């Protein structure tokens, strides 16, 4: 009898694309039992042999982890339990869906399974969830002789799609193990901090509500913007003196000239500079200069950059970006954004992908141009042998693209295009003042060829009035000499891109985590979102962290949550143990949560002050 | 000639720019019959100029009328800061120092800034030191102007300085 081979995919949609390129449009599609998810069939060759082929898929994570019964409830102390005692087992993410009993149906008379889930490590925790429930029904092994492989790919293309069919690997249990870790980590510090606050603050202030969280990564993140606001309500403002001189060219020009020691802070030196200048009535160039240099372009897009430009260009939060380019990957417009790699891999043609985007008015001739003349090689950057950067992989235009979807796919193509164009070349000029013993520059720039910077405007040269041509020893009337008293500003509070770059710096939220993080403190009511997409700490989120910090400054601070992700991390790469990290770790944490709880007096006073 | 090898030497100090008292001087010889101009300087670097030293300067330094002072003439550093720059952030980068000195011959004393850059001396550089003024320092609303060019720094060193007695 033929044999049947079983396909999975990690969304409905990604099944439907990916079953179209591999049978060369020979489809067959069915209604599965659930109705949100389909049955793809076609016949054609595996090892060497005729089978047929089904591909199906699941709907994101098909479980969460939960603890058996009873310690579900908030109400049931003793929630110290929750570190050791409590034993754990997997729950259906969505039972809704029904999602176990779907695969167990369709992978029972399947012969062989090839696993096509997204190609992070949340795709790979997946793979061995669907392999949990598909072995035990598969048809027996003879040798046995490997009858389980795992596709590995990261783009919904013709050419990806069919080139990881014909080189299948394994999937790695190694690093399947730090996300089970991962889970129970999160979950446990999670609930026990959270639980036991909900219940010690309950009814116990008028003005307070169940709105209160910990979370062993949530509340460094929250560290960050409470941090940012501590320095900021310390502050102390300083005067300063800015002396400016203003000199009239042949051209009947105002040119302004910046000073050279460029601010003062003493008042009675201010008043001294501007004596010695304010009665003098030429200023005479003391020196010229021209050098051309180069503005780089950019470095080839990753991950955090883009939930940065999402943000402070598009007013888009992070979670809403990674959705938002998550939905792009499966409909095949972009390479899949969960990546830290910022090189482009020598074999990687960029030439095939830059092509579909030929076409589309905004950048056509740009494109054209590139392709005549031959492409540049993009930066040398950093391979952390995860993915590529991220590219677009087909064409679009603004019709077929919503709103937002549109946007963001609109920015990811002109990076593209600017990674694979020629540096923008301009010249720096600058001429050299003196007045009176006073030293005075000004400075210009000249666009010489725009190069990125055609496509990426936003990144341009400012256009400005060409200086003065002139020679050492010529002189300037002097228009005006005035004396500006300014203050020095206080920072404002952290921008979304600004706490993205915090979380990078330190290590945490890895493995493009950071948007999940960022989002919670926002839903829990930690930080308020201001013009700006600045991140403003509520009350609550300010006690919070100001009380964890007199406890234990290492329950705020990214030091110890660094730590453990980089110990997962070497548990993926099979350097580390998965039980010898867990009961460190744990052990480390159960002796600060009995340390907390006597100490607990260092938050219940700021919540009296507040509430 | 008993007494008298301590005037000439007294003299031989104020050539060089040392101001001193004539009690400050018998106070750095080691005995009365042998003056030694070299053991006198090597002490007085290491002694406060506000215990031995004359008063050279006038009075109204401060005041804006003086615009000129003559060297040679010794000095002793009270307190440094970068008058250039924000009290709070103080070193970082975007700014050129322009130090503010407050200065003293051990009766006036008298502010600067560094107006051109002077490698010599820094923030760091320890109250006490003992810096040689000369030529002609040009003296702007009471500020004196110092550069590479006018100013010597000849060491020395005070403990546990205390600017206001
Ligand atoms: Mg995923």
């Known amino acids: 009898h033929m044999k049947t081979v079983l396909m999975v995919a990690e969304k409905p949609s990604l099944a439907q694309s990916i079953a179209k390129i591999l049978s060369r449009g020979s489809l067959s599609s069915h209604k599965g039992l659930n109705g949100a998810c389909s049955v793809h069939e076609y016949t054609g060759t595996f090892a060497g042999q005729p089978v047929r082929f089904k591909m199906t898929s699941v709907c994101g994570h098909v479980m969460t982890l939960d603890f058996l019964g009873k310690y579900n409830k908030w109400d049931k102390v003793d929630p110290a339990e929750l570190f050791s005692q409590a034993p754990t087992e997997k729950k259906e993410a969505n039972p809704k869906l029904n999602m176990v009993k779907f695969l167990q149906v369709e992978g029972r008379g399947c012969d062989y399974i090839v696993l096509w889930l997204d190609c992070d490590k949340e795709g790979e925790n997946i793979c061995f969830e669907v392999l949990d429930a598909v072995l035990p029904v598969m048809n027996k092994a003879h040798g046995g002789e ?233 930066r040398k950057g950093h ?84 200086l003065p041509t002139c020679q050492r020893g010529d002189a300037f009337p002097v228009g005006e000499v005035k004396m500006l008293e300014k203050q020095t500003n206080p920072p404002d509070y952290l921008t979304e891109a600004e706490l993205i770059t915090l979380m990078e710096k330190h290590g945490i939220g890895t493995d493009a985590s950071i948007p999940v993080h960022i989002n919670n403190i926002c839903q829990r009511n930690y930080v308020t979102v201001e013009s700006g997409r600045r991140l403003k700490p509520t009350n609550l989120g300010i006690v919070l962290v100001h009380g964890y910090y007199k406890i234990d400054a290492e329950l705020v601070l990214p030091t110890i949550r660094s730590a453990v992700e980089k110990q997962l991390n070497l548990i993926a790469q099979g350097k580390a143990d998965y039980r010898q990290v867990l009961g460190h770790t744990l052990d480390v944490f159960k002796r600060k949560f009995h340390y907390f709880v006597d100490s607990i007096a260092g938050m219940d006073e700021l919540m009296e002050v507040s509430f | 000639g008993p007494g008298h090898m301590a005037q000439v030497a007294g003299a031989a100090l104020s050539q060089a720019g040392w101001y001193l008292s004539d009690e400050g001087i018998e106070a750095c010889t080691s005995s009365p019959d042998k003056v030694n101009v070299n053991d006198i300087i090597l002490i007085a670097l290491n002694t406060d100029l506000r215990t031995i030293g004359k008063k050279f300067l006038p009075s109204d330094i401060n005041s804006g009328k003086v615009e000129k002072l003559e060297g040679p003439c010794v000095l002793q550093i009270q307190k440094i800061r970068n008058v250039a720059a924000p009290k709070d952030n103080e070193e970082s980068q975007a700014a050129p120092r322009m130090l503010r000195l407050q200065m003293t011959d051990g009766h006036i004393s008298c502010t600067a800034v560094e107006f051109s850059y002077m490698s010599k001396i820094s923030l760091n550089t320890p109250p006490g030191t003992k810096v040689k003024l000369s030529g002609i320092v040009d003296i702007k609303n009471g500020f004196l102007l110092l550069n590479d060019s006018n100013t010597t720094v000849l060491g020395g060193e005070v403990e546990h300085l205390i600017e206001k007695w």
Not at chain 1, 159 to 174: K, Q, S
């Open chain 1, 146 to 378: 490997k009858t389980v492989f795992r596709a590995r790919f990261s783009s919904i293309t013709d050419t990806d799609i069919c080139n990881a069919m014909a080189c299948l690997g394994e999937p790695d249990h190694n690093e399947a193990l730090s996300v089970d870790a991962r889970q129970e980590l999160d979950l446990r510090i999670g609930c026990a901090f959270t639980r036991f606050q909900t219940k010690y603050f309950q009814g116990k202030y008028g003005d307070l509500d169940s709105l209160i969280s910990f979370g062993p990564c949530q509340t460094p993140t929250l560290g960050f913007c409470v941090e940012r606001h501590d320095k900021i309500q310390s502050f102390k403002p300083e005067t300063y003196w800015v002396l400016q001189a203003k000199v009239n060219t042949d051209k009947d020009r105002s040119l302004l000239l910046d000073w050279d020691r460029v601010r003062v802070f003493d008042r009675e030196i201010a008043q001294m500079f501007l004596n010695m200048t304010k009665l003098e009535k030429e200023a005479q160039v003391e020196a010229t200069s021209r050098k051309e240099k180069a503005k780089q372009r950019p470095l080839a897009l990753n991950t955090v950059e883009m939930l940065r430009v999402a943000s402070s260009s598009l007013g888009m939060g992070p979670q809403h970006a990674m959705q938002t380019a998550e939905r792009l990957y499966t409909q095949g417009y972009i390479s899949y954004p969960r990546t830290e790699t910022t090189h482009y891999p020598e074999n990687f043609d960029l030439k095939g992908s830059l092509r579909q985007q030929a076409n589309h008015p905004y950048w056509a001739d740009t494109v054209k141009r590139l392709l005549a003349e031959g492409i540049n090689r993009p």
């Open chain 1, 383 to 466: 391979d952390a042998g995860d993915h590529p950067p991220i590219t677009p992989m087909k064409s679009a235009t603004e019709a077929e693209l919503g709103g937002d979807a549109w946007r963001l796919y609109e920015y990811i193509t002109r990076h593209f295009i600017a990674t694979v164009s020629h540096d923008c070349k301009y010249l720096q000029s600058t001429i050299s003042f003196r007045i009176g013993p006073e030293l005075f520059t000004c400075s210009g720039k000249t666009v010489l060829s725009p190069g990125f910077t055609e496509v990426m405007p936003w990144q341009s040269v400012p256009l400005e009035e060409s």
